[PDB]
């Protein structure tokens, strides 16, 4: 089976690239197997694929660590993304996003129902397992809980049938028999979630697969658009059906390959405690548990020496940041033009820990619009944070087409040299705040309301007769053949891609 | 002659640091020299030596490009500016910046007189001279003059005779026998000029010295108090009485080894045109020409074999970043804890184009006085937005204790993630803005007064009982022997200073 459609052969795929590194000997998941993960993440090495794990028993389970964070070198750096998607491993992240929103204007395709897949090739009831005797890793060493699902798909389905979404979110182990998890608006799996519980009449039906298809677990962070089956989607992106097979002990759908699958319910009524967790914008607040969702677990199924994947997640740079970030703002810079905005490029810079999105704007576009700074803003801001693509996102950096969104030093440079504080800004209160950046939910203000901006980094002549600057740089401040002259004499004179 | 004390013998310092490039084959001072020297700024490469300038005569001049830039190691990142000031050349940027604030609590050392120096081994008067005829460089297409005064001092007294000021501005070539330049509110050129024109007798007598001592350029671009004289500060700081001559025509003092020395007046009356200039923000608006102020050259002395430095300045990294921000950032330190401001550290981020200072904040002390942030932001902006040393610095960001300030990845984590946008911020309007900023002088509102912010990076329990949070990072996520596990056993299970 193809990288893009098999997590086994994804992992495969990571060794013949010369991007893994197999670890043989034992590994604890008691922090040990995360700690090794948060390494590779901050220094950009090959992603870890535990092999003997302590507490691996009957098949379940060895651990891959770092599945989507970046590589050494800047000519493959997002090659294990480009690896979710069938992309050569040199691919920008411009195609990278391209071929994640492809799908948006095409017809869906539909999954495939097959009758079994390697995923059923062995199996516990609810007399056979205990979430607590699994080695489930403890991540960070103040987290109030063992996360299991860090890197898991959840599959749930609207009461009426017409829409079946796949979504990460965390979930840590509570007992044998259940996780609790992050629900939270405006996410996909609470606003089924809340269908279910105005019907009021069962749990939800539930499935959660890890190691799924590489395509699926990319669309499954997107946020794509309300009602939008991600199943469907997925088919449309990579050309091709997805392989499906049904849960044994509810009719949900799980990708035929999926590693290890959970089968039960998500409580309408029930919480447990859950948190603390290491989170996406660097912090844990130790002890600080809260309520969240409640999920039982009836069966699990799983293939021969499954493999669980684990995103050690924190500071720089994991899939919190790569796959998060970048996949919001690609849907932004979708829905910026959608809403006949002239955006041509959009990327969470990870500077500022995937807090903000720089747009980039088509000028001439601009201009023929014979708007203001302060009416576009206020335009840009609308659109953006009153959606939910716009949810985690708190700062919105207008610049104009010389500037690389993808670069965060240019970012960086035209937020910090184009934008007078205040004056070129918009302070938007009441818009739906992302209450895990610190400065919301353990900040000054409201958790879940306001502390987002959109500041301008256009300059004035952006908006009426053309940029009026040259770049005071080596490419900008001479002329082609002096610049050829002296790359030709570089080394000659004394002087110091793959 | 040591290196901190003698230009030529900082030259002779390079070469053997193997951190010069001598070029001995013909370089026109026509953007050449200056592309060579950009091409080394954006790489952090070894400085350049132009022996052979297109245009040299009679022994002027030879270019010392990119004197106080970044060199590529990590290790000796900031070597060049420890080699202005005898420290080792694996100096820390605190170290360097502690040394450049020691004079502040020292008696002065004045100058010594003495009768003669090499600056006097050649000589040119007014009939021998034409400035339009040295190899004067032009730094950028685009810009208006011929730059030669980019890395040289200012020589002005006041009127009284108390307070001789040294300082960097720029000048450009107007004709044979003069200059025009920036001389602008509220810098001590500016200050001492006013006081010449309203006494309102003559033109102010100046000089402008080139390859002065390493250690007398450093606090010529530092921002040290009204009415301290430079050199007596250079004395304290190094130690010795720095050795001054007499100019010729005139009767201020001049380093006795500067490579080159105009002697002249500054006009209290006439002014010329000026600029642009591709200066420190990264920016050149062509054409945008304005008066400036008006220099008239009487004499030059020099140096055999002189050698003229140059910055070739503009994006990053060069010495308008390395030694203005810096410098300024210092200052501002010991400004706020003159104030009795609990502040331990500051720096200007490479990455905010130096308009940014970090001050790294004593959250014990800051718990004592029982403040709020709102309280808090306000006096720190009042007292550094009011004084002269915050003149450039249009955002301050407070930081705690766990963020090293000179590491601009970490102040960016901290100001994207616990500075709520708007909440946490306070806008101050009525303050001494910097013109030189794209979006202060090219933007949307008065180019002298506003646009700067003081942002609060502290969390809430920072004031009150402390640090509440942990970092999800591998040095604080894990404990100390599972780390060094780690750390040990990293290139055996397969993954990978000077
Ligand atoms: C890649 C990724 C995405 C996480 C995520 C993680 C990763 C690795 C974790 C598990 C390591 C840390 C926490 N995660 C959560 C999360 N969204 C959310 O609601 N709760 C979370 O707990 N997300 C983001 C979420 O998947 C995206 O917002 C999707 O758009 C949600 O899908 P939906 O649009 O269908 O609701
Ligand atoms: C290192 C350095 C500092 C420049 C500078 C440059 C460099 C290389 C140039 C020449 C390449 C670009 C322009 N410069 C100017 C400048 N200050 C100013 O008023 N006008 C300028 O034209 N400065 C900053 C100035 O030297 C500091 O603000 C000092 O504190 C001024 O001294 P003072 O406190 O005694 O007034
Ligand atoms: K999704
Ligand atoms: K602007
Ligand atoms: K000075
Ligand atoms: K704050
Ligand atoms: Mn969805
Ligand atoms: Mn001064």
Request: net charge negative.
């Amino acid at each position: 089976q193809p990288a893009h459609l098999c997590f086994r052969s994804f992992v495969e795929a990571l060794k013949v690239d010369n991007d893994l590194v197999e670890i043989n000997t034992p590994i604890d998941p008691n922090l040990e197997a995360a700690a090794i993960t948060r390494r590779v993440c901050e220094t950009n090495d090959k992603a870890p694929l535990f092999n003997n794990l302590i507490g691996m028993k009957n098949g379940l389970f060895r651990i891959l660590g770092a599945p989507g964070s970046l590589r050494k070198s800047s000519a493959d750096r997002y090659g294990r993304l480009a690896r979710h998607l069938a992309l050569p491993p040199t691919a920008s992240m411009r195609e990278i996003l391209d071929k994640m929103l492809s799908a948006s204007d095409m017809p869906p395709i539909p999954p495939t129902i097959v009758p079994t897949g390697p995923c059923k090739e062995n199996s516990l009831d609810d007399s056979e397992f205990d979430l607590t005797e699994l080695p489930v890793p403890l991540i960070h060493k103040s987290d109030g809980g063992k996360y299991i699902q860090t890197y898991g798909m959840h599959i749930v389905q609207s009461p009426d049938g017409t829409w079946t979404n796949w979504s990460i979110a965390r979930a840590m182990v509570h007992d044998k028999n259940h996780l609790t998890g992050l629900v939270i608006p405006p996410q996909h799996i609470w606003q089924i979630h809340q269908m279910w519980k105005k019907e009021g009449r069962s749990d939800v039906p539930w499935a959660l697969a890890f190691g799924v298809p590489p395509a699926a677990i990319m669309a499954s962070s997107m946020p794509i658009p309300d009602g939008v089956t991600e199943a469907g989607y997925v088919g449309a992106m990579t050309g091709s059906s997805l392989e499906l097979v049904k849960c044994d002990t509810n009719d949900l759908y799980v990708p035929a390959t999926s590693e290890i699958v959970l089968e039960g319910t998500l409580s309408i009524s029930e919480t447990g405690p859950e948190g603390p967790f290491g989170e996406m914008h660097g912090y844990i607040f130790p002890g600080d548990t809260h309520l969240g969702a409640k999920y039982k677990v009836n069966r699990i199924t799983y293939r021969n020496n499954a493999i669980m994947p684990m995103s050690s997640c924190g500071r720089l740079t994991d899939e919190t940041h790569t796959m998060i970030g970048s996949l919001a703002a690609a849907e932004i810079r979708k829905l910026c033009q959608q809403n006949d905005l002239p955006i041509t490029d959009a990327f969470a810079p990870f500077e500022s820990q995937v807090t903000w999105v720089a747009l980039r704007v088509d000028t001439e576009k601009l201009r023929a619009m014979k708007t203001t700074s302060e009416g576009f803003r206020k335009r840009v801001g609308d659109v953006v944070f009153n959606h939910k693509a716009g949810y985690m996102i708190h700062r919105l950096v207008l610049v104009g087409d010389d500037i690389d969104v993808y670069e965060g030093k240019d970012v960086l440079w035209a937020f910090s040299t184009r934008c007078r504080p205040g004056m070129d800004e918009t302070l938007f209160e009441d818009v739906r705040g992302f209450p895990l950046i610190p400065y919301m939910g353990h900040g000054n203000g409201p958790a879940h309301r306001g502390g987002k901006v959109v500041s301008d980094a256009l300059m004035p002549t952006e908006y009426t007769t053309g940029r009026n600057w040259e770049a005071a740089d080596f490419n900008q401040s001479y002329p082609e053949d002096l610049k050829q002259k002296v790359l030709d004499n570089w080394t000659k004179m004394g002087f110091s891609h793959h």
